[PDB]
Amino acid sequence: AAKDVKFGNDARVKMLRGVNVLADAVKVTLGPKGRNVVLDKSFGAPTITKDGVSVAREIELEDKFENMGAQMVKEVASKANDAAGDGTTTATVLAQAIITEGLKAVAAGMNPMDLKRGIDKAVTAAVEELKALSVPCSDSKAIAQVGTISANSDETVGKLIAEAMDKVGKEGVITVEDGTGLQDELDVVEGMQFDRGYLSPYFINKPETGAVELESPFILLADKKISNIREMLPVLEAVAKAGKPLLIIAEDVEGEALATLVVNTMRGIVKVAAVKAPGFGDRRKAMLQDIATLTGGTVISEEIGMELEKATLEDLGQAKRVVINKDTTTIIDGVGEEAAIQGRVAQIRQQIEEATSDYDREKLQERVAKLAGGVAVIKVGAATEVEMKEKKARVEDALHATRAAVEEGVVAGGGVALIRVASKLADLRGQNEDQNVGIKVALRAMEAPLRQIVLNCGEEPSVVANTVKGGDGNYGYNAATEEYGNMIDMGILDPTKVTRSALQYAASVAGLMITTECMVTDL
Amino acid sequence: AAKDVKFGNDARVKMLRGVNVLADAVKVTLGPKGRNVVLDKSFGAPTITKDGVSVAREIELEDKFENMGAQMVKEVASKANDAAGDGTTTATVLAQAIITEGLKAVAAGMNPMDLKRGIDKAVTAAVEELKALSVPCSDSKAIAQVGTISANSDETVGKLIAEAMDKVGKEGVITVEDGTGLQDELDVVEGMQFDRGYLSPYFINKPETGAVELESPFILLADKKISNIREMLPVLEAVAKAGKPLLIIAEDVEGEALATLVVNTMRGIVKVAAVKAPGFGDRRKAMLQDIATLTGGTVISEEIGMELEKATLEDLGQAKRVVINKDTTTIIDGVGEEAAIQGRVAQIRQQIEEATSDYDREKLQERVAKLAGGVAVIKVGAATEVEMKEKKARVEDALHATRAAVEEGVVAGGGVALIRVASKLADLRGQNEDQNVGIKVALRAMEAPLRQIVLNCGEEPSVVANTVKGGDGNYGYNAATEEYGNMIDMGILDPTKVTRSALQYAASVAGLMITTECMVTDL
Amino acid sequence: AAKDVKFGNDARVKMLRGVNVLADAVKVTLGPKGRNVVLDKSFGAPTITKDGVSVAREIELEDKFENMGAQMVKEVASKANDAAGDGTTTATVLAQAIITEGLKAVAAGMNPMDLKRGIDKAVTAAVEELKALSVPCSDSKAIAQVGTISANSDETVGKLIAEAMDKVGKEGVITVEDGTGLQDELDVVEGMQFDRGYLSPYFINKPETGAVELESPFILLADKKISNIREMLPVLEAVAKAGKPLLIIAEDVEGEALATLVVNTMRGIVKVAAVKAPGFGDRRKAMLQDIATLTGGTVISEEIGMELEKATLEDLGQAKRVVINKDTTTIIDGVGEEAAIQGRVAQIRQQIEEATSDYDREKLQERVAKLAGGVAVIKVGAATEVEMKEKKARVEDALHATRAAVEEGVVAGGGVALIRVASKLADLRGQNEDQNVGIKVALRAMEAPLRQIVLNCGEEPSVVANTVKGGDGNYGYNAATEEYGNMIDMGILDPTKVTRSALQYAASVAGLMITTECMVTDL
Ligand SMILES: Nc1ncnc2c1ncn2[C@@H]1O[C@H](COP(=O)(O)OP(=O)(O)OP(=O)(O)O)[C@@H](O)[C@H]1O
Ligand SMILES: Nc1ncnc2c1ncn2[C@@H]1O[C@H](COP(=O)(O)OP(=O)(O)OP(=O)(O)O)[C@@H](O)[C@H]1O
Ligand SMILES: Nc1ncnc2c1ncn2[C@@H]1O[C@H](COP(=O)(O)OP(=O)(O)OP(=O)(O)O)[C@@H](O)[C@H]1O
Ligand SMILES: [Mg+2]
Ligand SMILES: [Mg+2]
């Protein structure tokens, strides 16, 4: 269609208006005094959330240029959520601050490309200073504190995540699922987790979470891909009367002959899913056999000759719950046989003792770690569905924050870490004056998370930011109790990965956003 | 017509919106970093002004309820301008702060009338503390500094006002009038100032200043009020052909047979004005004779028999310039005869030496002070008319501020005095908790001038207000040089009258503005 | 009515848009390659003009804020025209350049008040440098060149003005009036010129020139002010049937019972005018007698007893043409009697020889200079009315430029003088950085006249401005011949007064409007 073309300050102010609308929508959910946001859903009841990425994804504007700015900044929250699962609101606030101050510097007649270069240099130095300032979560041992801070000052969620990490190890898999009671339960059941995703994007279930769940699914395993379609048609017909959703674990699955025909077959009464198998060759067969033994199923092969036409409902495996994500596909509870599971674990341990090759040894330790750790399931208990969704989102944030803390370490929370690493960069300089001004813009935008947190509390952000800048170390402001102190000692811990990722993504998108002179869109 | 009637929070927010529009229009002109405001004029070129009362007077809003609020707060600026001639911007800012915080308190459920009572008590205590904290301008001897600060950091204006007060005394009459060159010139000439005003409001000249000026006026004096018009009809005809506008100085003047017939006679080509004569009986005759001798004219009387029908144009007096105001009517330059003026001065001094009655003695000293002091005329020099008006307004502000300083004293400027008197009232309490909340609202609203001044500088008002509150005495922030120090030593002085008047009028109006529950306006 | 209030950048850009519209309308008439502007007139045929102030006065915009900016900049052209009668386009261009660069500096976050202070300081230093750089027109003797440059490279107009100044002296009065032929003609006749103006603004004739002309007027003189109407009513009636418009020369004339009655008397068939008489007492009587003898009239006085009731048409004086302006009222051609004129000249010269008082001697020399110089009338010859008006405006510009040249001196034309005096100020500095940036803004805006002149020629303003800046002395660019050289030697001379006045008025108004934050107007 015909395109509308805006230039210079008009385009910049329209894009800034869109950015500001999206951020102001998001920024009200920052800190412990931050508030919730009601998101209208055409599907059902409205969703109340404190999650920044949900608000950002829901935001869309009427004006095309403001919508351009809003989408381009929404990219920050989306990337932060994908990378770390937390700090989306902080990333959006940082992007908004960088954009505002960069547009101020652009109005002053400064070269926007040099401003972008200065912002990038300052952010790189800041990331280095964060890596230097980070303190490992193993040394601190404050997993409960990280989970509590991430769960909006919820002690129970933090203690639950700490217990779950104590049971299945600091690296064991944990899955958050809806509970049934009014209290949060921790279930440590048998399951199997592998980094694989669904082949087709249509397999997503009704909720927009991007991960499809199957209620009491059925397990199908195979290592060789068969040519014809009619051969497993009796299997699908048996699946068409087993009553349980079918999950297909094989080497790889296509769509033109399987996904399209199955889409045209039924209207979605029962969701049929297919996933890849991790590894290749002998390893793929090994994990396929392990999964089959876990779920009580069997794996077909050329050597065995166990053709699917002879496969029955009893032969194939079954699980109580399976959740499939593009990043990683997990099995929540595969019944199988407990004695069979223990025997397989003993056999794999004996293989570990016998094996000596470093690659074989390490993959065998990975297998036994997956088997022994199991699947830790946290039941989100709430009296209503809206509270179920809200608390489930909070527990997911706590889980991601704890994972980031164990993977990379922790820093003082409440924006104090960015305040500190901004003070150490006061002597950083660039090639020219515009680059130096961009560096200063990046340094000022690092106070934005703390200033926003204080603004949500009703206090004065300038005074509190100055007071925190006057301190040293982990000295900062406790937004929950309206007093200053040591952020680490007060248990307000933020993962280093979350802060670094938010800073980096906000920096990239915002620095690209201040070099824009013309914007083209429809009419 | 039919009335639109609003209730409760809707009426309160409409009123607050109007108040905020007016105050935001006014508040941009506060402090040395305050900016000018352009007022569109239907007559000619737009007026550029930093004066708060002009902006407030020009503000009028489309929405009827918002217009209610705007007029209600414009009352504050008008009252402050009338009382002190300075501090209209500060008064408007204080009223806006009181209104906003009182509406916040009302939304919290506080009783608005008790809040108003608490605000009144706090403001009375603050006025007492201002009187206690005031420092006389005679002891300080900083007239030049007061004028310079009042003239928006113009050293030349302050030095000019200091010289004028040195010449005609600290109580002499000083008049600001348009000059001709590009430089400000001070002229000390012979004239008379007496506290009387125009009888009819029709006499207002084309400018909205409220005071009519006459270019080379003619002087008419009389102590007896004659009945029939036809006796002065030859006099009026001679006046209506002499070429110089007529000023009538007599006991008292009507409008139904004088102003109405004049309006029906003249269309405004040459203005004819009539003023009252100060004093009564013998005193009125004495001042009439003094004015006639000053302008070279004569005074008619029944005893003398000097009938106006025989009066000629040469017999009547003449002045080079006369300015008439409702509060006080002054004669700028009456030629008369210098020898006659000196002889009259000597005669009145001899009368002083002969007289012994306290009332007669004091009125004779007032007469000789009026004659000896003369009229100090300040010629505003500007290359254009807009600069003429702007600099004339600034010089008028300096004049009023210096008068208030000599009359009442000075306090630390830049909102520091209100900050200091806010801390001294921290222990003040009212009858109930509502009154205490009102007192705290009044105390917080008294930081508004300093915070607004700092905001205009582009600094952070919270931090600077905190730093000033942490000091003591005359410690404060220099908005002109962006540094702290002793307000008095740095030369930024505010008259105690101006600050006290702004506080009191803002308090009265704003406190009455938060007790509203219904608004009744047209449709 | 309800007011529209705009803040910050919105008001700034609206006012800048109005300023730019008015200037772009005006700026096309700058330099020798500048073009004409057609102005619609409801009175009659459209007017083609190259005069800046005419275009500025005709400009009025639909949007209220843009209209405010346009009016405020129109003030620059009006003030320049009033002060110097030339350089109004240069004044408007300088104002526009200052406004644009000051708004650019304001967008950069710089204090507008300090920018205004820096602009004022730079302009003051520039005026001093212009006074230093000025070269007297007596030493140069290039009156023809000044008139030719001012008359849009018209050699005949310059030579005519040079001849007139030679005939009547460098200070003698010259009047431009419509001719009858197709050629410009110079007439040196007998007349009277005195610095007085019309008492009432209603007396302005049909054209908007602000000066009323009377076709074969009648002369009325008086030294004593008359009282009633009925004693001169026969005199007016004789005047009201003599056939020639009446000019009243007296001490001072009112409007209440004289202007209003005469306005109600006629609808505008024959204009009756009254003017003041310069001087007082004996001097006023002396000039009244001189004017009466020049026009063959008589003077009414109390001592003589010659009462107006007995005055006849033959007794009163008559003139061939009279032009009345607020600044100065002149008599173009008074017939009277040549022998009487010569006898009066001889008598006044004898009085000069007899008189010895310095004031009396100097006023007598002024009288004899007025009589001997006479009135030099330039007849503007054109084949049509539009060409009549255009060439008359050009000759008026040449006259004003030549008067300014004799009064103050000349500098190199074509914006070269401002370029030079801007280079000498490159080392000027202010109190702070914002003041320095304002100084630089003023220095850059001084290249604007030259850049606009080159832009009108189709050349590249940047290259030519750089080339002129690289030169020294009066080296510059000849816009008429598209070559560089010495502007003085090439005959392109500009009066120092014109350049200085344009710079000063542009500076004042433009600097006042870069400090505007809010903006109030109707809806
Ligand atoms: N009690 C507290 N006192 C001070 N700061 C706190 C406190 N609790 C949390 N914070 C800080 O507030 C932020 C957490 O807020 P929140 O989790 O709502 O936002 P986020 O991390 O940007 O991401 P998201 O909204 O997507 O979860 C972190 O910067 C954390 O350090
Ligand atoms: N250099 C300065 N530093 C700090 N404060 C200053 C300075 N100059 C003036 N002030 C303060 O700013 C105020 C004067 O500003 P401004 O003249 O604009 O407003 P006003 O006096 O309230 O009234 P109005 O606008 O009617 O003249 C006073 O409170 C004065 O003490
Ligand atoms: N031949 C020329 N070469 C270069 N510059 C010239 C030449 N003739 C005139 N100028 C310059 O052009 C300007 C005169 O232009 P113009 O008379 O059209 O403008 P103006 O007097 O400002 O306008 P307006 O008549 O509307 O008041 C002066 O700066 C003069 O020095
Ligand atoms: Mg978070
Ligand atoms: Mg003031």
Ligand SMILES: [Mg+2]
């Ligand atoms: Mg010209």
